[PDB]
Amino acid sequence: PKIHYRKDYKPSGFIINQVTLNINIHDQETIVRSVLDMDISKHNVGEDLVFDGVGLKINEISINNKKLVEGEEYTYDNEFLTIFSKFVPKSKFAFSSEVIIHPETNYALTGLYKSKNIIVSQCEATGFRRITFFIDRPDMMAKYDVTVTADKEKYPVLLSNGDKVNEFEIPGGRHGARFNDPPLKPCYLFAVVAGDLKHLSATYITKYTKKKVELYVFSEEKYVSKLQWALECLKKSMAFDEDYFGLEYDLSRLNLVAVSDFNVGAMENKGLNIFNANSLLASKKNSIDFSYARILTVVGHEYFHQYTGNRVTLRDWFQLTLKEGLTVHRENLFSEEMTKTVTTRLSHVDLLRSVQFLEDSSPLSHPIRPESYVSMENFYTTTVYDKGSEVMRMYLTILGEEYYKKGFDIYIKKNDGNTATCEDFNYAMEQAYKMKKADNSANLNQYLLWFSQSGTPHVSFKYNYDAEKKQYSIHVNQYTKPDENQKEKKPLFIPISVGLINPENGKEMISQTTLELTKESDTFVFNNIAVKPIPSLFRGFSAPVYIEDQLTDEERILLLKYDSDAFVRYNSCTNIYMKQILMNYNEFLKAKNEKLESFQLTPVNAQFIDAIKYLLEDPHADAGFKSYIVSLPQDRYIINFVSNLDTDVLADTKEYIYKQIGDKLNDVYYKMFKSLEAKADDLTYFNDESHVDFDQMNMRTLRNTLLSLLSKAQYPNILNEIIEHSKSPYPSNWLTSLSVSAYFDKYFELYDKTYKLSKDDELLLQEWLKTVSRSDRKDIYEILKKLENEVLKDSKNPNDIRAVYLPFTNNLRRFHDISGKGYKLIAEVITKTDKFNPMVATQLCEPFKLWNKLDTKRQELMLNEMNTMLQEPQISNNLKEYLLRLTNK
Numbered sequence: 001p002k003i004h005y006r007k008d009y010k011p012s013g014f015i016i017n018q019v020t021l022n023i024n025i026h027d028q029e030t031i032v033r034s035v036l037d038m039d040i041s042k043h044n045v046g047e048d049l050v051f052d053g054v055g056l057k058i059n060e061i062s063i064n065n066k067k068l069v070e071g072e073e074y075t076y077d078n079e080f081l082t083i084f085s086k087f088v089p090k091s092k093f094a095f096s097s098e099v100i101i102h103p104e105t106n107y108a109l110t111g112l113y114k115s116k117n118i119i120v121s122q123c124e125a126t127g128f129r130r131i132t133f134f135i136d137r138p139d140m141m142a143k144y145d146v147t148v149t150a151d152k153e154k155y156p157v158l159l160s161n162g163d164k165v166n167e168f169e170i171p172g173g174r175h176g177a178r179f180n181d182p183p184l185k186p187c188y189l190f191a192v193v194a195g196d197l198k199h200l201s202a203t204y205i206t207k208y209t210k211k212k213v214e215l216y217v218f219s220e221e222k223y224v225s226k227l228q229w230a231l232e233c234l235k236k237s238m239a240f241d242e243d244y245f246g247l248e249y250d251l252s253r254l255n256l257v258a259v260s261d262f263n264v265g266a267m268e269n270k271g272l273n274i275f276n277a278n279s280l281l282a283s284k285k286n287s288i289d290f291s292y293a294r295i296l297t298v299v300g301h302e303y304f305h306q307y308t309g310n311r312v313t314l315r316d317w318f319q320l321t322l323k324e325g326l327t328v329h330r331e332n333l334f335s336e337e338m339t340k341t342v343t344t345r346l347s348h349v350d351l352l353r354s355v356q357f358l359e360d361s362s363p364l365s366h367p368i369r370p371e372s373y374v375s376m377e378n379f380y381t382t383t384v385y386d387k388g389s390e391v392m393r394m395y396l397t398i399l400g401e402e403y404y405k406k407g408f409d410i411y412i413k414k415n416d417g418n419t420a421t422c423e424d425f426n427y428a429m430e431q432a433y434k435m436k437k438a439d440n441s442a443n444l445n446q447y448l449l450w451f452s453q454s455g456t457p458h459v460s461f462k463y464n465y466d467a468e469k470k471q472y473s474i475h476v477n478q479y480t481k482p483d484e485n486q487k488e489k490k491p492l493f494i495p496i497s498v499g500l501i502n503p504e505n506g507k508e509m510i511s512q513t514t515l516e517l518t519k520e521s522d523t524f525v526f527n528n529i530a531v532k533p534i535p536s537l538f539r540g541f542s543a544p545v546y547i548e549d550q551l552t553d554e555e556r557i558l559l560l561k562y563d564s565d566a567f568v569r570y571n572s573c574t575n576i577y578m579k580q581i582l583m584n585y586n587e588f589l590k591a592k593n594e595k596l597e598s599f600q601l602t603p604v605n606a607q608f609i610d611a612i613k614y615l616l617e618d619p620h621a622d623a624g625f626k627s628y629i630v631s632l633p634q635d636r637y638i639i640n641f642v643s644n645l646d647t648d649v650l651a652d653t654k655e656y657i658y659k660q661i662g663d664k665l666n667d668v669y670y671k672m673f674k675s676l677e678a679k680a681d682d683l684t685y686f687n688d689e690s691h692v693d694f695d696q697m698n699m700r701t702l703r704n705t706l707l708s709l710l711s712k713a714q715y716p717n718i719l720n721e722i723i724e725h726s727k728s729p730y731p732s733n734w735l736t737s738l739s740v741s742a743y744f745d746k747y748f749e750l751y752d753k754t755y756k757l758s759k760d761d762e763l764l765l766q767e768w769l770k771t772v773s774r775s776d777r778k779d780i781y782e783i784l785k786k787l788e789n790e791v792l793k794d795s796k797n798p799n800d801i802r803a804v805y806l807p808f809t810n811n812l813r814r815f816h817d818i819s820g821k822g823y824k825l826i827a828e829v830i831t832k833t834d835k836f837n838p839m840v841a842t843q844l845c846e847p848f849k850l851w852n853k854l855d856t857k858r859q860e861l862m863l864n865e866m867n868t869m870l871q872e873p874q875i876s877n878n879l880k881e882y883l884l885r886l887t888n889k
């Protein structure tokens with residue numbers, strides 16, 4: 001089982017200068033002919049020529065048009081093609097091969113595969129070797145000349161990278177297209193698509209060079225009416241890179257293509273971006289609101305890769321966060337600017353502190369630049385992406401916009417057209433840092449620990465105020481818990497964006513200030529502070545850390561009502577909730593453990609409830625923010641704060657807290673649910689796919705959140721509102737009506753009604769599946785069996801499988817049933833899926849990531865299922881590696 005080590009990087013002894021491909025698609029097989037124009041590098045020491053090549057059927061291989069003979073001149077073991085060095089030329093040579101591959105039965109969706117009636121490739125990370133022989137690593141840059149042939153009736157649209165330079169007819173009903181892509185690229189950015197594709201198109205004129213760029217968005221004919229928003233998002237993405245970063249697209253054409261079967265969200269193949277259909281296609285009649293932000297961010301993400309990933313690429317896969325963390329950061333800047341809603345940034349933090357913090361305290365914890373890997377298909381993590389993005393964002397917080405832009409342009413200008421490493425980016429940021437500090441001795445050497453140190457830092461505070469001196473002190477310390485990657489953790493460069501709120505009038509007491517904490521602890525003193533402030537700490541969530549604000553709930557309430565920073569307001573509310581959750585959890589736990597006949601629960605703080613009401617009733621306050629304050633923190637956020645978490649006790653705790661607040665605020669909730677209707681459900685632009693109103697969607701989020709609270713509470717006659725909600729044209733509304741009807745006798749009536757509305761659109765049906773999966777039903781196990789028999793069946797579409805099972809795994813009371821029946825069910829799905837798609841099988845392991853944080857009975861139950869999966873004789877490399885790491889074997 002080969003382990004790759006970051007420190008072992010060495011340049012290849014070979015060079016591949018030119019790739020000339022002929023991909024001939026036939027009904028039962030695909031024939032790939034490839035000529036590689038190669039050379040000997042300065043690092044060559046006379047080694048064998050070893051190509052990656054996985055699952056290829058060899059028809060012939062040759063060197064300089066001389067056919068090589070198996071056994072004598074080469075060996076092939078279905079993974080590596082080895083040409084013995086005595087037969088390898090010593091100067092420039094041509095290697096050629098013809099192989100047979102089978103996209104029709106390629107259900108792992110890596111390499112060349114068939115998704116419904118579309119032939120499509122996915123080559124990142126090491127999938128190109130599943131198409132033809134190559135030295136499959138991103139520092140092997142080459143030019144590509146690609147011809148694709150296929151039946152014209154089945155595959156009229158042929159696409160690859162670069163310029164289409166010829167189209168030709170072929171006897172027997174076939175046709176061909178030739179694409180030449182002169183700029184050097186790594187092979188993971190190669191792509192090919194063939195299908196009966198329909199499109200929308202537009203022309204974009206770049207801001208400075210005034211180049212005309214042809215934009216094409218493609219789907220199967222059935223869904224061509226769902227392409228409009230994606231095209232709008234692409235234009236928006238191009239304008240943002242031009243306006244913020246001064247970067248223009250360099251090619252004459254950009255194609256985006258939706259396919260139904262895709263392992264992840266989308267892929268940035270040069271000029272030919274390929275998308276999970278659920279991340280490219282939408283219409284107002286057939287998509288929930290979430291689709292619109294999803295398409296915006298994913299289209300943006302792939303577009304921003306054209307510079308951060310494509311034009312500046314990776315030396316090796318250990319640098320993955322250099323392109324993914326930086327592109328997520330660019331994507332997040334873009335989405336924040338396009339949506340103009342504070343909930344966009346809040347939603348990113350909420351994901352980080354639940355999913356990524358859980359990963360970072362799990363046995364899977366790794367730094368954003370790991371030291372080793374076995375499976376590249378398991379390398380694409382929320383740590384690499386989302387903690388990576390926060391590390392990339394901290395440069396902007398440290399430098400400010402002007403110097404960040406200066407440093408970013410240094411990075412692009414110095415590395416355009418080349419591979420790069422994380423050091424190259426830190427170096428560019430350091431040059432800007434010296435400029436900002438006016439100090440050529442300043443350096444960012446300490447910053448590099450963000451790339452190598454795993455785990456979430458904890459930052460805690462103590463305060464002092466001298467009223468006579470008007471002097472305020474913030475004493476700060478940082479700590480990262482030792483883990484399996486570093487026994488000793490070093491202090492990081494932590495930027496702490498801070499404000500000081502005057503508690504008497506709510507006003508700012510100092511200018512914008514970013515404290516630079518570079519030691520294990522430091523004391524920051526402020527003079528001329530006229531009154532004792534309430535500190536507003538880590539504004540905008542300025543570092544990816546556990547914040548221990550050491551504030552009272554009275555102080556947190558004051559920030560929640562009156563602070564200027566949306567994150568600190570949201571975090572102050574989160575912290576009030578967490579204090580209550582931990583207190584009530586321990587009270588319920590003690591009652592369970594001691595088998596008490598009576599006991600007391602500490603009520604929710606009444607001033608906190610008053611503050612929620614105050615914000616809810618503020619007509620100038622933001623609807624999306626309102627929906628966050630009436631929602632308790634995510635379960636996966638809570639679990640980072642409780643040892644041996646009993647999920648039933650936590651479910652009882654949340655129930656008590658929601659009921660406490662509802663018993664006071666339900667009339668407020670109902671009144672708002674009714675008063676929000678007119679603006680939230682406005683149909684003026686329902687038939688304009690170009691008109692997307694993120695504030696209006698946030699109003700629907702608030703209505704649907706309040707409806708959930710009111711339905712669980714059995715608010716008088718709320719079933720009438722649920723039924724009327726089911727008649728709304730907006731899928732977010734009528735799918736909500738299904739979810740909230742779980743608490744009423746009408747659930748299966750609405751189940752059938754919404755099924756009928758959903759069944760004729762592939763993506764809407766998947767949203768329906770998710771809604772059923774997450775329904776708060778006592779009979780959810782029977783319902784899942786019904787979905788399996790009636791809808792899901794033996795589909796191999798990852799979107800179908802993930803829709804049926806993942807939402808259910810977030811059902812705290814039912815997935816964690818003490819019998820272990822939920823763990824048994826998901827383990828059976830994982831093992832079944834692993835037979836044909838190991839990457840998605842490992843995705844389905846997600847609920848097990850917290851196994852060692854649960855109560856000892858549930859730890860044992862989860863471990864038993866993971867050991868059962870590990871004992872499967874046919875377990876994939878992906879799944880075995882993942883479960884061995886997760887179970888500390």
Ligand SMILES: O=C(NC1CCCC1)N[C@@H](C(=O)NO)c1ccc(-c2cc(F)c(F)c(F)c2)cc1
Pocket residue numbers: 109110122124125126127263264265266267268301302305324376377378380381382385839
């Ligand atoms: O969609 C995404 N979602 C993110 C969210 C948190 C982690 C993943 N990530 C994109 C991306 O970064 N696009 O730019 C992406 C991720 C993985 C692959 C990939 C890698 C492989 F080894 C394969 F075998 C394969 F089939 C696919 C392709 C694209």
Ligand SMILES: [Mg+2]
Pocket residue numbers: 054055056057100101102
């Ligand atoms: Mg094969």
Ligand SMILES: [Mg+2]
Pocket residue numbers: 207239242
């Ligand atoms: Mg413009």
Ligand SMILES: [Mg+2]
Pocket residue numbers: 297328331
């Ligand atoms: Mg995103």
Ligand SMILES: [Mg+2]
Pocket residue numbers: 260762797
């Ligand atoms: Mg299907």
Ligand SMILES: [Zn+2]
Pocket residue numbers: 268301305323324327
């Ligand atoms: Zn990406």
